[PDB]
Each structure stands twice: as structure tokens, then as C-alpha cells.
């Protein structure tokens, strides 16, 4: 169940669901595994908020263990296309693709809550079939791995060689270490 | 099924579901296992109530056997961020993560119903793979265990050494013992 809230306006009272209420204030939630359907919904929200106001920041709240890459790159490419600065915040955790969408936010507007945790690794995949087809799909996921490391280096500021060494295996980063690593910019410990 | 209630206002009658009605009075329910989706819903409610009024207390009613930690820390970090004091009440039970969110409430505004019961233990986890990966995930959950014990000590007032000894195995606390342990502040036996 999803609670319903009421917004007071000049015309009259208005009934909203809680997630649609926050969308009115330019807040998007990225929850759970990243798949084609949920990601296609986040794209629709970003495009809508750009049209409603292209000069006001969009906020993307991330609590996800990651998922499909191609579904996540649809979110990434949209964030870079649109004019508004997509601020990203990590709540709970932001793993493999969730961490890539976290660091892909606008520079200076990427945050981590004080006890959140970030995880980064290299792409996972697989194939079954002839050796000629295994070579094709093996070359492809390596190109994806190279592309994801270049973009990680671009946004984090690190070198491509450093990103390659750290993402060969799972690497957990606390919220302070994510700041030092360039993955996020600061921490929202308390409200001021 | 969820019953519908009616609220009488000056403009006219208004139909609400029972959970959305209580949200209008700044009451949130944390029921069942703690997962990413239910926790992302509780965060949305807390943020909404802060915006509607940042000086009025929020109430979080807890009846949960716990669940995922990363989902629970998204609730914890939100409670500490927002300006309103999040009062917590334990109904029925508040186990591993539910107990951590119970004690994380505002000091002086944490309660237990007279027959409720609290349980605390150390994190549960697991991994399957190479020994190099087992070392990584084993070190991580130990850091989580250390972080959860520090925060338990901060809010309960106990020492870190006492929290470590008591959480090595499951430890049940009645509502009076939770008060003596610093986990909650008082008991709501009757209404006065």
C-alpha cells in the first residue's frame, strides 16, 4: 500500500500519492534492481521535469543493488542530455550500476548519507553456445567494461588505471571514503 | 482490505484510508520485514512531514522482526537528518534492525508498550565464491558490525564493550529491561 497525501492550493484541495507528491517537487526515487521497465519510468520522469522547468535541479534518490547495465545507461544518457543538473543522493546502498548513476550526477551535487555504503565492481555476464559466438559476446562485455571504466574515471577524477585496479573485484566504500575517492562530493550528516 | 475513514473539514467531507489518515497526524508505521521498497516508502513519508511542518514531532510505530541492514540505515540516516524529533514506539516486537531504529529515536521520546519485547544480535550474512572474495565480504560485514555497535552505544548510553558482549548472541529484553538498558526511555502502560 502507498499512502495518499493532500496538497493545499488556491484552486482547492488535491489528492496525491506520496511518490507522485515528491515528483511535483522534482524528486525521483531509484529503488531496487535496475531493469528495463523501472528505468524507462525514471527516464519519463526526468524528461517531464525538464519540460516543466529546465532551470530547476532534479533530485535522484538511490537505494539499489544494481542490475542490468543497458537499463542503467538509458538513465545515465538521459541525465547528461537534459539541461537541469541531476543531483544524486545515496540512501542505504548504491552498488554496481547504482554507484555509476550516483557518480554520474552533477558535479558538486552528489551526496551520501552518513552511514550509506557504495560498492563497485566490473560487469557480470555470460553466454552458452558455439566458440565463435562466445568470442563475440566476450569481446562485447570487455568493450562495455572499458567504457564503464572510462566514464567512472571521468566523473570521479581518478585515472583509468586506478579504476581498473579497484574494480577487478568487489570494493566497498563507506560514505567518507566515497568523498575521498571522488565518487561523491560531501555528506548530509545533519540539516542546517 | 483497508478500511476507509471520513474526516470532517470546513471545505467538506474527505475520504481517507486509515493509514493515510494517521499520516496526516504525523504517524508512520514500520511493519513486517525491513526491505528496500518499504523502507524507501518510510523515507518518503518522513521527508514529506518535515516539509509540511518542521517543528512538529513525527511518530514511528515499530512492529518488525528486522530485515536488511542497508534498507534500515536509509531510515536511520533520514531520522537523524530531518529537524523534527522522530519519536519511536515498540508494539509487539522490535527485533534486530527494528530495535536499532527504536533506540535511534529522539532522546526522551522512545517508548515501549508494557508487553512488547526487544531482541538484539549481530549482523547475519554470507557469501559463496573464491577465498579472495570471501575475505572482502567478511571484512565488510565486520565493519558493519563495528558500526552498528558504535551507534547502539551512542544512543543507549552503554559502553562499546558492553554492546559487543550482549550482541554476540541473541538477547531478548522485556519492556522494563529495555528502559534499564537505555534502549528506550519509558513505558506507555495507560493513558493519562
Amino acid at each position: 500500500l502507498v499512502p495518499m497525501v493532500i496538497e493545499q492550493t488556491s484552486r482547492g484541495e488535491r489528492s496525491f500519492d506520496i511518490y507522485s507528491r515528491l515528483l511535483k517537487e522534482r524528486v525521483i526515487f531509484l529503488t531496487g534492481q535496475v531493469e528495463d521497465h523501472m528505468a524507462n519510468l525514471i527516464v519519463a520522469q526526468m524528461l517531464f521535469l525538464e519540460a516543466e522547468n529546465p532551470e530547476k535541479d532534479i533530485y535522484l534518490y538511490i537505494n539499489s543493488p544494481g542490475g542490468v547495465i543497458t537499463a542503467g545507461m538509458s538513465i545515465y544518457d538521459t541525465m547528461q542530455f537534459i539541461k537541469p543538473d541531476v543531483s544524486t543522493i545515496c540512501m542505504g546502498q548504491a552498488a554496481s550500476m547504482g554507484a555509476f548513476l550516483l557518480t554520474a550526477g552533477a558535479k558538486g551535487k552528489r551526496f551520501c548519507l552518513p552511514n550509506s555504503r557504495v560498492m563497485i565492481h566490473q560487469p557480470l555476464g555470460g553466454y552458452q553456445g558455439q566458440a565463435t559466438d562466445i568470442e563475440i559476446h566476450a569481446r562485447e562485455i570487455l568493450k562495455v567494461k572499458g567504457r564503464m571504466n572510462e566514464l567512472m574515471a571521468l566523473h570521479t577524477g581518478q585515472s583509468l588505471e586506478q579504476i581498473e585496479r579497484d574494480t577487478e573485484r568487489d570494493r566497498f566504500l563507506s560514505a567518507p571514503e566515497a568523498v575521498e575517492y571522488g565518487l561523491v562530493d560531501s555528506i548530509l550528516t545533519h540539516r542546517n | 482490505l483497508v478500511p476507509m475513514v471520513i474526516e470532517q473539514t470546513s471545505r467538506g467531507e474527505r475520504s481517507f484510508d486509515i493509514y493515510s489518515r494517521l499520516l496526516k497526524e504525523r504517524v508512520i508505521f514500520l511493519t513486517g520485514q525491513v526491505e528496500d521498497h518499504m523502507a524507501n516508502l518510510i523515507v518518503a513519508q518522513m521527508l514529506f512531514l518535515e516539509a509540511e511542518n518542521p517543528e512538529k514531532d513525527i511518530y514511528l510505530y515499530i512492529n518488525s522482526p528486522g530485515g536488511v541492514i542497508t534498507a534500515g540505515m536509509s531510515i536511520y540516516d533520514t531520522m537523524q537528518f530531518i529537524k523534527p524529533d522522530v519519536s519511536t514506539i515498540c508494539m509487539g516486537q522490535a527485533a534486530s534492525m527494528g530495535a536499532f531504529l527504536l533506540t535511534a529515536g529522539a532522546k526522551g521520546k522512545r517508548f515501549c508498550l508494557p508487553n512488547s519485547r526487544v531482541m538484539i544480535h549481530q549482523p547475519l550474512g554470507g557469501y559463496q565464491g573464491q577465498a579472495t572474495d570471501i575475505e572482502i565480504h567478511a571484512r565488510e560485514i565486520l565493519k558493519v558490525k563495528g558500526r552498528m555497535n558504535e551507534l547502539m552505544a551512542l544512543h543507549t548510553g552503554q559502553s562499546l564493550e558492553q554492546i559487543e558482549r550482549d550482541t554476540e548472541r541473541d538477547r531478548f529484553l522485556s519492556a522494563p529491561e529495555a528502559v534499564e538498558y537505555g534502549l528506550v526511555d519509558s513505558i506507555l502502560t495507560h493513558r493519562n
Binding site: 507528491r21 515528491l22 517537487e25 522534482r26 524528486v27 535541479d57 533530485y59 534518490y61 543531483s87 543522493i89 551535487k109 551526496f111 548530509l188 | 521527508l47 514529506f48 518535515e50 516539509a51 518542521p54 537528518f81 529537524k83
Partner: peptide, 9 residues
């Protein structure tokens, strides 16, 4: 606004 970044009175 309502979010973390948005300011509230």
C-alpha cells in the same frame, strides 16, 4: 521543496 537538498522553514 520537500527533498533533502530543498530547504524547509
Amino acid at each position: 521543496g520537500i527533498g533533502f537538498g530543498a530547504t524547509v522553514k
